[PDB]
Amino acid sequence: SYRKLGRTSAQRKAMLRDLTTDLIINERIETTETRAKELRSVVEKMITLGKRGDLHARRQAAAYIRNEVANEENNQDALQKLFSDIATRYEERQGGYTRIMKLGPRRGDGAPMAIIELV
Template sequence: MAELRKLGRPTAHRKAMLRNQVSSLFEHGKIETTVTRAKETKRMADKMITLGKRGDLHARRQALAYIYNENIVKKLFDEIAPNYSDRKGGYTRIVRIGPRNGDGAEMAIIELL
């Protein structure tokens, strides 16, 4: 399995943060975050969209185990995933937007294609 970035967070905090970012991405279509967080969010978002493309009950339950908001999972399976039915992968795009003013961290926008 690929190496997971730790993002300077304890495990529980990191998992919760990534779940929230994936949920926000599906809810709003794009989010602004740091580049390393965007890369990890992209990995999980692509996995969730792949589950949405499968569309069966088991896939829906797997998605609900990761994304706790039922409305977002419904949107994922009914609206987002069908848009990518003919696409093999790469459902998200990361666009670098330069350093953050406060601490100089490299920022990016992650968006659904």
């Protein structure tokens, strides 16, 4: 099935949306191991939506991506980055746009940490 991640039904959705947008922005994220394991699927689905490029997929993506700035130099939205920069980079891959690398335990709570990045 799917993990509940210790949240309620709405907080889980909010954290997933936030992490997806953050990974789109920064190209590489550090978070817990299970959060990355659950984030992989949604971020790959949104990359798949961006690879289409039509208006319908653009609005489906917009109904889930946060309103944040990718880079201030060109006044570029995260959605614009998704549909212009990444979709062009992964034009030949059939799936598997991410990779998780395990780091080790956190000091505060012993949680297992992991880096999730775009290939």
